[PDB]
């Protein structure tokens with residue numbers, strides 16, 4: 006059985022110095038005021054999962070990366086805060102990091118920003134923005150190998166401009182903005198695995214979201230134990 | 237009743253150091269040779285108001301910013317100087333800064349540059365250009381949250397290139413150039429509130445200009461007292 | 468009519484440098500993370516007032532100081548947080564600072580710590596503790612001329628030890644601990660003005676608390692305007 | 699299942715640097731000449747346990763701290779050395795550190811120094827004294843939240859004066875000396891949980907000692923494995 010350290014080693018190519026620094030930040034990144042709680046039980050965000058906000062593709066990309074999909078239109082900012090939504094990503098991340106192949110080949114993100122509103126942007130404070138940059142760079146044992154933004158409205162770059170200065174050069178050149186005509190370019194990066202809504206052949210986003218919702222609910226006891234092991 | 241200092245505090249998030257520096261510049265920015273007078277009575281620029289050069293939307297943008305509209309085609313450079321036109325903005329600014337919600341949520345500018353001529357550019361000397369940059373950055377207690385240029389002719393960037401080096405990074409990334417196809421992108425930033433000429437639903441620019449002209453004329457006694465309180 | 472600056476000048480013996488620094492801290496002390504809101508309306512803490520937690524003596528001490536009394540036993544930590552309780556002191560402070568004689572002769576505090584529990588101490592985090600020290604020293608335009616602790620249980624000094632290192636030498640030598648046998652020594656500091664419960668002759672704490680509760684409720688519109696003038 | 703590192707992280711509020719330094723000292727503190735062995739089997743100190751020298755309260759204090767009681771009168775210095783007695787505390791400590799709530803809320807100590815003799819003091823050499831200070835400060839993953847000395851004879855401070863210079867400021871202000879009249883003040887710190895001998899209501903020290911003796915004997919195999927894992 007793997008140590009807790011092994012996922013941090015694999016995240017930094019078995020460089021013990023870098024893995025150690027990542028481990029340090031992993032334990033303190035939440036503590037940055039205002040803090041986000043260590044609670045990882047799905048009960049407070051099950052509405053988000055049911056709304057079809059988020060899902061994970063069952064198949065990997067050509068490099069073996071786990072592929073995550075987020076749909077901002079299914080996040081109601083009146084009901085769920087940025088911290089609720091961030092907690093969903095933390096829950097997903099703690100689950101997929103258990104896979105060794107994900108530890109080795111990292112992850113890729115697809116953000117459908119269609120329906121992004123100013124109400125969404127209101128949630129993204131400078132404190133939240135730098136927390137976003139933290140988990141994307143050096144505060145969580147997952148290698149972000151690519152970030153793909155699709156259907157981005159012009160009003161979004163104000164939010165991105167808040168996040169950008171806290172991003173490393175490595176992650177910045179891994180961010181792709183495809184616009185409303187995303188299908189061809191997105192298909193190039195992710196052949197055979199995309200859902201129907203994004204140019205895929207077989208599965209729909211609804212099934213993908215429901216499947217991941219079930220997996221999260223099913224893993225609620227592991228999530229509770231992880232929450233216990235970081236406080 | 238608010239002190240005179242409160243609008244400067246709100247302009248700099250109640251940082252007394254920064255508010256103090258802003259207050260210092262507010263009193264000396266006009267004095268930069270060649271100086272612009274402290275006269276704020278509308279009698280010398282009523283022709284500009286009647287020509288429909290400028291107006292303020294009655295409703296705020298999604299973030300609560302006051303929205304100002306300028307139309308360069310309605311400025312006759314043969315009749316009014318750059319100082320006359322600048323005085324119009326000063327008059328408007330001293331009026332809208334009285335609103336606490338504007339003090340908190342700042343302003344956004346829409347410049348219809350359709351009909352911009354070389355005769356307009358002739359008025360924009362280096363001295364005028366840096367005065368423009370001064371009030372936009374750190375010489376007036378109003379937070380410029382966005383500048384939107386529409387219908388910009390290619391000959392305009394020479395003027396913008398004069399202004400740019402005196403602009404901070406903050407204000408530079410808040411400037412948007414939409415070109416002649418501005419409607420969709422402008423509507424994204426300003427839903428429900430734009431006039432008919434710019435994709436809106438109800439009000440026309442003429443009514444908006446006339447309404448603001450009336451408010452300025454109505455406020456002529458307050459404007460005189462402000463002019464007295466800065467000299 | 469006095470400026471807003473005058474209360475800060477009187478707080479620092481008309482030293483403009485010191486008054487200015489106090490004014491700076493007055494605007495930023497709440498902002499220290501985690502922040503306490505600027506809300507000063509009594510609606511959220513009326514239960515505390517009705518419980519008889521706090522009251523102000525109608526007569527001043529021999530040096531002209533306003534005298535405040537707090538009773539920790541009437542604070543239910545299950546119902547009200549430390550921030551609720553702190554807000555009560557802020558509300559009282561913004562009201563009594565309006566009196567010029569209080570601006571000149573400062574205030575004195577009497578804390579009846581009888582009934583202090585660990586549940587009370589649980590509310591006093593390091594962040595709260597340093598906020599306490601801030602308003603007591605150089606973040607509010609009121610001169611704390613004396614702090615009198617009575618009926619202090621032995622378990623309280625742990626809390627005081629949290630506050631002490633953030634206290635100046637001036638305020639530390641103005642703190643008095645009288646124990647359970649407080650009457651004689653307390654009477655020396657405050658002749659003729661104490662309530663019946665603390666060795667006084669005429670008024671009871673209940674009447675004093677009810678009288679101050681009424682004054683706070685009566686001043687709810689001024690409190691709202693103050694809250695507006697600091698945000 | 700928790701790593702071995704987790705108890706050190708919880709001991710230093712998940713500060714990886716501080717937890718690492720604590721882990722370093724945990725492995726080397728015994729090695730300080732003259733060394734104390736890593737033997738943790740109760741067979742060599744069962745006489746001490748049977749003599750009623752030491753026991754652990756079944757209920758926690760109001761802050762969730764585990765409460766330990768030592769009775770110096772039940773230590774015969776002719777039969778057991780300081781190293782034997784120290785080993786008893788090590789055995790107890792390695793057992794109670796397994797509880798997560800103890801890892802989070804630390805421990806508190808009650809030392810009944812009634813019957814302290816010069817024969818006891820003879821055992822406390824400078825080397826022993828600094829070993830005492832080591833485990834109390836930064837050499838064992840248990841947070842000492844309070845040390846309560848009761849019935850201390852005047853001849854004891856000579857011993858305490860040997861220990862004091864090696865103690866941090868944090869632990870020094872957590873040491874309480876109650877004297878022979880300890881009951882009221884001790885009851886304040888530890889309501890509802892004290893034994894009959896110290897003002898409690900239900901349980902006697904004899905039962906408490908016997909209960910902890912049984913738990914130690916019952917845990918003899920875990921104690922052997924721990925001894926194996928540090929050499």
Ligand SMILES: [Cl-]
Pocket residue numbers: 040041042088
């Ligand atoms: Cl939270």
Ligand SMILES: [Cl-]
Pocket residue numbers: 159160412421
């Ligand atoms: Cl845009």
Ligand SMILES: [Cl-]
Pocket residue numbers: 271272273319
């Ligand atoms: Cl002029």
Ligand SMILES: [Cl-]
Pocket residue numbers: 390391
């Ligand atoms: Cl060109």
Ligand SMILES: [Cl-]
Pocket residue numbers: 502503504550
């Ligand atoms: Cl609050």
Ligand SMILES: [Cl-]
Pocket residue numbers: 621622874883
């Ligand atoms: Cl005590």
Ligand SMILES: [Cl-]
Pocket residue numbers: 733734735781
């Ligand atoms: Cl030995």
Ligand SMILES: [Cl-]
Pocket residue numbers: 852853
């Ligand atoms: Cl003596």
